[PDB]
């Protein structure tokens, strides 16, 4: 009960933060998405036909090549918001961080074009709670919990703004102060079983617009941009003058530092951010369009509706997930 270790991440686009894995004997590497919104384990399978042009594109696990894989073979279907793997369970070693453990993860065989043939990864690593784990499968984190090397239940996460460096930064069993500073205010969740707050308002500027009488916000690893639903986000973007296309909003580039501010009150705490923190600044041409690193997502119940807390609001606030308090920590990003 004294390990701490820590997981490097490439930042691609500001848009995903993956790091390495290691599956089976002889490790098989994969580029995975460490999820705070999910639970299960999953890479590509060699058995996902190569019609499915993303298996075509990612790296596959051959079971037939690892000594230490186990059957299972039990039929699973993941479904996100935005898109859906389906496949089977196996059972093999997966070493994350130095640490090595035995997990039951999905082998994917159908993987839709889209979205996955825009994932710079190959799979996800679920960092929530058995509760939502689909077949009631034990996450990642709590075998590694239940090996007792930790230093304490509790993991971190530091996405970086720079998209040559380190790209981002999960620390199992604490927290980096290389990478934060001032201190934490921690939040506690509304229940077990998801990494989900109470948000009691969304500001613009400052006139408190959203969340009124309060709201959901699911702090969430795996999500890009910052997100509400349609009819919530409809109302944001209506604020900041922004356009909607079909899959983001966008402003004129001329516009994007005028943006005002946008807050969400968490914990009693205003968490804000400036045009700077959630604006795509590729120009300052009025000719040209600038993208929104906010967008609507509809989660549904039990989980939503709900706002998602993505890479957007977890690049200015490292965040500590608390497994022994079920609280969330927020500090200052640096
Ligand atoms: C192209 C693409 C497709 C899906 C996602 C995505 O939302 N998840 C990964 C896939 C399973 C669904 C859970 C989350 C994504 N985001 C990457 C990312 C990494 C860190 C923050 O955002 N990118
Ligand atoms: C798959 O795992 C479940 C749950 O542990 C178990 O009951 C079942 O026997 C397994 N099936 C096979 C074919 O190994």
């Not at 090595?100 to 929530?128: C, I, N, R, Y």
């Not at 580039?253 to 969400?264: Q, V």
């Not at 549904?300 to 608390?322: N, Q, S, V």
Request: aromatic share 12%; proline share 4%; hydrophobic share 35%.
């Amino acid at each position: 009960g004294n390990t701490t270790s820590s997981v490097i991440l490439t930042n691609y686009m500001d848009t995903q933060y993956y790091g390495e894995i290691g599956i089976g004997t002889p490790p098989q590497t994969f580029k995975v998405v460490f999820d705070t919104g999910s639970s299960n384990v999953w890479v590509p399978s060699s058995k996902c036909s190569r019609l499915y042009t993303a298996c075509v594109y990612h790296k596959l696990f051959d079971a037939s090549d690892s000594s230490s894989y186990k059957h299972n073979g039990t039929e699973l279907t993941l479904r996100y918001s935005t898109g859906t793997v389906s496949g089977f369970l196996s059972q093999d070693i997966i070493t994350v961080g130095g640490i090595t453990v035995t997990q039951m993860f999905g082998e994917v065989t159908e993987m839709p074009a889209l979205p996955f043939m825009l994932a710079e990864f190959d799979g996800v690593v679920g960092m929530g709670f058995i509760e939502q784990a689909i077949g009631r499968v034990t996450p990642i984190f709590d075998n590694i919990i239940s090996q007792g090397v930790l230093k304490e239940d509790v993991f971190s996460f530091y996405y970086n703004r720079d998209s040559q460096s380190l790209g981002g930064q999960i620390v199992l069993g604490g927290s980096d102060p290389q990478h934060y500073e001032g201190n934490f205010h921690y939040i506690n969740l509304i229940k077990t079983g998801v990494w989900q707050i109470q948000m009691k308002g969304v500001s613009v500027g400052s006139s408190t617009l959203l969340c009124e009488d309060g709201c959901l916000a699911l702090v969430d690893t795996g999500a890009s941009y910052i997100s509400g639903s349609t009819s919530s986000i409809e109302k944001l973007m209506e604020a900041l003058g922004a356009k909607k296309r079909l899959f983001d909003y966008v402003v004129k580039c001329n516009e994007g530092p005028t943006l005002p501010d946008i807050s969400f009150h968490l914990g009693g705490k205003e968490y804000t951010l400036t045009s700077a923190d959630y604006v795509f600044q590729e120009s300052y041409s009025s000719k040209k369009l600038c993208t929104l690193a906010i967008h609507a997502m509809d989660i549904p119940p039990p989980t939503g509706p709900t706002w998602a807390l993505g890479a957007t609001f977890i690049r200015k606030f490292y965040t500590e997930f608390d497994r022994r308090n079920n609280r969330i920590g927020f500090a200052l990003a640096r």
